[PDB]
Task: inverse folding
């Protein structure tokens, strides 16, 4: 018997108000043939996890009595890295010591342990296995635990919609220092796409620019420069000199920033909106739609990879391999280790409150 | 020889400052084999016509000296109804008395006559021909003169992008009292599509609403109602009771109105923006793109039909048949007849100045 902890809520609301910790049992002596028990290594806090709890994100786990509660309760967290502890008699795809992530969203990763079926999980190579496979790196816990949302988002937006000609064509993105933005710059470099990253001005601007360019952004401009009529010829020349075209815009900001990046595209451009900065709508001039054959659409990795296991698998495999081959780097998380002195839900509540400090990873 | 008049400008600007009327001669008795001489019967004043004159429209006729000016001067007008008066020795597709429209944009329709090739024109049936062939109606001059843009725009937006299920599915549009809006309502009735028309409020709202419903709008709402959060449930219930979905939004306004109609689409909705209400960008909440698989695109009839003569023909033939059958109606134009006692360009200048009165048609 294993006693486990899970972070739950019985009603939607702010995490600081509605979260609690539930102790529950998992019978490791009574595994069904296709069942596996996993023990959590780490799980991050993403905006989507918080919005889910808040009741404003339309993909969420059902409230159930599964954790032995008095009322139906929902678990929390959609991504996480776990270690396989024990497998049932018919399980061949997993064995003890393997690393896994959930195969689907809404699994609930803010907890110490989970019992599921072997197909509720996708195997990642653990460091010993990457090493034995001759790879120069193994995945870190943070890499494994955040692999399933941000890296896939960047990869898919860049490859699944418009085909950019390698060595010629351009994408432009705002939120250039966001997690997805930094992955997009790296993947753009790997795919041989040119890119412009648009970022907020800041005091250490020269250093941030050099850092993004090392990641793979071809050019970096500020939002003031994006807005500036008089800075605008510089950008047209960049694209002209390359011999290609700006075909794709990635928007996670909205408002004036969305306008500014849309206007930099050539004719027949596509914008994908994958995020937003509160009550700031996507704002595009009428003339771009009518006279420049401009299209604006959305991206939501959750919906896209719903009923597309092959696309999910093959994208995941490439991201894993790139970490192993030293070709992709993650932003560092602030790690809080659960040792059992403080209620689990409180580590996550602190993480939520401290979101502006950086990506919060609760580790175990 | 024929003595003709054309409305020209040598410099871009407001029509009231830059237009003048140029006399020119057309060699009546000296047509090349494929050439055609037409007399204008009527040409409307459209916003795009004015925008070309202002120099802020991306598709314009070349400035030349072919009208007998001293400087380069461009003609005016893209839409118009002409009557063939004489044809060259190898023309078989057209004869004297035939009604025709220009086959391409930038023809210059604000003039009394023109010389072209047979392939610069598309034939429409004249009323004598429709009548002789047993049709209950023939085209009026206004119908013919205005057939080439607005009716085709309404037909194509409704049928070429998304397939609406007869009896069940919905489109929503703003500018419901616009020429295109009133065509879309009628086409909606004829093809059994449900529709919501959003219109600005006005002192005679009830009369306008009754009139749009007779043309074929299923429901008519004000912009206030469009902006109301509390009205969402009524719209949701209209769509639920029909068993269909709101799949298509037609936007010619921008700003809050565009937000409003977008929000009323079901998942997987498409917006086509075909016009805009002066410095009001298309404004779409982030959540629609991410969570409702919303797409926003453009519509420009000039670009769509450039190299799709067959789509143009087929569409036009339908509008022509509906007019002959009495199934489609135009909005009545204010007509100013050119008789030689007032300079032609002054008739157009007055029309531009009187745009708020209604569509202006100069006749000959």
Result:
């Amino acid at each position: 018997m294993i006693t486990a902890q899970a972070v739950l809520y019985t009603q939607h609301g702010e995490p600081k108000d509605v979260l609690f910790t539930q102790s529950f049992e998992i019978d490791d002596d009574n595994l069904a043939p296709n069942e596996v028990i996993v023990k959590t290594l780490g799980s991050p806090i993403n905006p989507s996890d918080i919005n889910q709890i808040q009741g404003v994100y339309p993909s969420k786990p059902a409230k159930t009595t599964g954790f032995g509660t008095a009322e139906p309760a929902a678990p929390c967290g959609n991504e996480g890295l776990f270690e396989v502890i024990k497998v049932g008699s018919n399980v061949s795809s997993l064995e003890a010591g393997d690393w896994v992530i959930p195969s689907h969203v809404n699994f609930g990763t803010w907890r110490t342990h989970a019992l599921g079926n072997d197909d509720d999980f996708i195997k990642l190579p653990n460091p010993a296995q990457s090493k034995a496979n001759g790879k120069p790196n193994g995945l870190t816990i943070n890499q494994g635990a955040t692999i399933s949302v941000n890296p896939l988002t960047a990869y898919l937006m860049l490859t699944h919609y418009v085909k950019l000609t390698p060595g010629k064509d351009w994408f432009i993105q705002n939120g250039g220092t966001s997690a997805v933005g930094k992955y997009a710059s790296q993947i753009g470099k790997l795919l041989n796409f040119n890119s412009i990253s648009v970022i907020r001005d800041r005091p250490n601007l020269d250093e941030v620019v050099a850092s993004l360019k090392e990641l793979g952004a071809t050019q970096v401009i500020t939002e003031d420069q994006n807005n500036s009529k008089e800075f605008g010829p510089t950008i047209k020349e960049w694209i002209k000199q390359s011999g290609g075209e700006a075909k794709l815009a990635l928007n996670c900001v909205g408002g004036k920033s969305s306008t500014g990046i849309a206007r930099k595209l050539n004719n027949n451009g596509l914008m994908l909106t994958y995020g937003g900065m509160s009550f700031q709508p996507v704002t595009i001039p009428t003339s771009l739609y009518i006279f420049k054959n401009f299209t604006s659409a959305g991206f939501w990795v959750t919906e896209l990879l719903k009923n597309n296991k092959e696309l999910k698998t093959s994208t995941l495999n490439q991201i894993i391999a790139w970490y192993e081959e030293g070709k992709l780097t993650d932003a560092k998380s602030i790690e809080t280790l659960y040792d059992g002195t403080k209620p689990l839900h409180e580590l996550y509540q602190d993480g939520v409150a401290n979101s502006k400090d950086g990506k919060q990873l609760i580790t175990y």
Observations:
- Chain B touches chain A through 29 residues (CB under 8 Å).
- The CA atoms of residues 167 and 187 of chain B lie 13 Å apart.
- The radius of gyration of chain B is 22 Å.
- Chain B has two domains: 1-153+311-364, 154-310.
